Amino acid sequence: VETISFSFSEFEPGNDNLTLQGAALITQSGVLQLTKINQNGMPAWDSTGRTLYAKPVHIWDMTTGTVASFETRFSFSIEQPYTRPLPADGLVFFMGPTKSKPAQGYGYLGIFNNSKQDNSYQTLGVEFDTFSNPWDPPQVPHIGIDVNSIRSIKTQPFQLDNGQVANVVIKYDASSKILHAVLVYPSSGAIYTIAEIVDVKQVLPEWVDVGLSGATGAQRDAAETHDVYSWSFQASLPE
Amino acid sequence: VETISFSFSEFEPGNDNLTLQGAALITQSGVLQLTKINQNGMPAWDSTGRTLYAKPVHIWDMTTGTVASFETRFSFSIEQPYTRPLPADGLVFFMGPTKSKPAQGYGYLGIFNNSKQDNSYQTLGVEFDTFSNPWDPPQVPHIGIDVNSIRSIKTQPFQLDNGQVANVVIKYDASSKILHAVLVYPSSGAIYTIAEIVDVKQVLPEWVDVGLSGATGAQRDAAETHDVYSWSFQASLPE
Ligand SMILES: *[C@@H]1O[C@H](CO)[C@@H](O[C@@H]2O[C@H](CO)[C@@H](O[C@@H]3O[C@H](CO[C@H]4O[C@H](CO)[C@@H](O)[C@H](O)[C@@H]4O)[C@@H](O)[C@H](O[C@H]4O[C@H](CO)[C@@H](O)[C@H](O)[C@@H]4O)[C@@H]3O[C@@H]3OC[C@@H](O)[C@H](O)[C@H]3O)[C@H](O)[C@H]2NC(C)=O)[C@H](O[C@@H]2O[C@@H](C)[C@@H](O)[C@@H](O)[C@@H]2O)[C@H]1NC(C)=O
Ligand SMILES: *[C@@H]1O[C@H](CO)[C@@H](O[C@@H]2O[C@H](CO)[C@@H](O[C@@H]3O[C@H](CO[C@H]4O[C@H](CO)[C@@H](O)[C@H](O)[C@@H]4O)[C@@H](O)[C@H](O[C@H]4O[C@H](CO)[C@@H](O)[C@H](O)[C@@H]4O)[C@@H]3O[C@@H]3OC[C@@H](O)[C@H](O)[C@H]3O)[C@H](O)[C@H]2NC(C)=O)[C@H](O[C@@H]2O[C@@H](C)[C@@H](O)[C@@H](O)[C@@H]2O)[C@H]1NC(C)=O
Ligand SMILES: [Ca+2]
Ligand SMILES: [Ca+2]
Ligand SMILES: [Mn+2]
Ligand SMILES: [Mn+2]
């Protein structure tokens, strides 16, 4: 069995186990700020930042046809300081081709280049979308399961607890092909759940990079924070 | 669309929207005690209690072949006062044939008569099992999805937070046929998730009774409490 796992209770600056891209940075306080925060403490618009684990993950093997089961957990907080314009754009946990660089920002969340369903993306993602684009359901924020497109195959609205820490659990059972995600706000006790069938063999390459990506809006002050406090991951390829 | 829903933030004695069976009873404090608590405040062994919603639910229609999506949420607490013998047996959320009376107690949780996979049970259940029977995995407690048998098709171990309130969310998406359940302990922040594919058309009759059942052990003092604080349910049959 081929296993891989990591667990960051907090982030330490200078760590070489994480690849920071775009605006992403680790603070001295141990927080991973996916998108830029200005000198005045306000989140900057037109910002995109990602963080990829430094080792690729063996998700499936073409030879034996076996696929890995995996689980990831992370805590984040989003703060929306302005009433107008509408805050944007959100953050997303994703898996895709190795050696990737950030894509388009804004509503594409740093992982897509357009709104088409393209098999060449080879990307699986679980988004926490805060801005309603024309390809989105009208309710925001919402959790969404993205398969080769920013147009989710399944969506679940949730109420943002402004600036409060949200705990997320995403689990994939290779046997049943079910991807199930849970979001809990300890502050209010709110629990949201979403699940959908996804056969990763039809989506992802055998080896993938796992990461988190965040983006702020295309217009002035259409922004919010995308802070991550911890992140753990584990995958097992039956072999 | 045929919809049905209920929501009990707390329970009131004398309420005629709930059918109490066996040892189940609602206290003046508004708590639903599934299993008996003695005069000295200790949980009694050899006890079985159930509570069914007073109206049957239309889960699927043979004529059109459509099936309902549903969701239930409830809060409970289990207290295990003795180190020996091992506490037993657990509680379970279930759906089965209308007009049912309690079955065998103990490890059968008041809903089964033996440990066979029998299609005549026509029962779907999500158990919170505290005692390891020969048909159980060795880890207890565990969440389990039961389909026509006490031998779960899927199990997930969890750590009991003795006497603390656990929040449960069980959701069934008819389109994908996924039954996903979540258990959260606000006290410790623990989150457990379990999902499996279940086609209710192959399991349940068109009309079902929904309920909660609990049972204590077969030997002296093999007991624990099975207290429920709230319970809501909603189902929608696309029509
Ligand atoms: C977080 O980042 C940490 C820092 O990078 C990770 O820890 C490193 O993990 C490296 C493995 O990828 C590991 O590398 C090996 O280092 C050996 C020498 O260092 C040890 O022994 C020294 C005395 O001999 C001692 O002084 C040190 O303190 C260490 O204890 C070295 O012998 C190994 O070489 C063998 O294997 C390599 C292939 O891996 C061959 O190329 C080589 O011929 C030889 O056969 C190996 O060296 C590394 O090899 C590749 C090369 O590019 C690297 O430059 C070279 O370092 C390294 O020891 C530790 N570093 C430290 C300080 O402990 C950490 O990884 C996790 O933890 C480690 C312990 C291991 O269990 C990993 O599998 C884990 O993933 C990162 N954590 C996470 C979650 O990602
Ligand atoms: C929790 O328990 C509650 C108490 O049982 C539930 O509320 C009852 O719900 C009954 C529906 O199942 C409802 O019954 C109807 O009552 C009508 C008369 O009462 C109202 O109007 C009076 C003045 O006219 C007023 O004084 C009262 O206070 C009420 O406002 C009556 O006209 C209805 O009869 C018609 O329909 C029936 C079929 O349902 C026909 O048989 C009849 O010919 C006529 O056409 C109906 O009467 C009931 O009929 C069936 C019979 O066996 C019953 O004995 C008879 O009562 C009843 O009014 C309320 N009770 C109260 C105090 O409000 C509650 O149900 C939920 O809430 C209600 C309001 C409704 O929305 C339900 O659909 C909900 O489920 C239970 N809650 C839950 C979550 O289960
Ligand atoms: Ca969007
Ligand atoms: Ca058992
Ligand atoms: Mn979206
Ligand atoms: Mn069991």
From Swiss-Prot, chains A, B:
Subunit structure: Homodimer.
Function noted in UniProt: Galactose and N-acetyllactosamine specific lectin.
InterPro entries: ConA-like_dom_sf, L-lectin, Lectin_LegA_CS, Lectin_legB_Mn/Ca_BS, Legume_lectin_dom, Leguminous_Lectin
Post-translational modification: A minor C-terminal proteolytic processing site is observed at position 268.
Pfam families (UniProt xref): Lectin_legB (PF00139)
Sorted UniProt keywords: Calcium, Glycoprotein, Lectin, Signal
Coiled coil: none
Sites carrying sugar chains: 17, 113
Miscellaneous: Binds one manganese (or another transition metal) ion and one calcium ion.
Top-level taxon in the UniProt lineage: Eukaryota
Family (UniProt): Belongs to the leguminous lectin family.
Protein name (database record): Lectin
Species per Swiss-Prot/TrEMBL record: Erythrina corallodendron
Single GO term (MF): carbohydrate binding
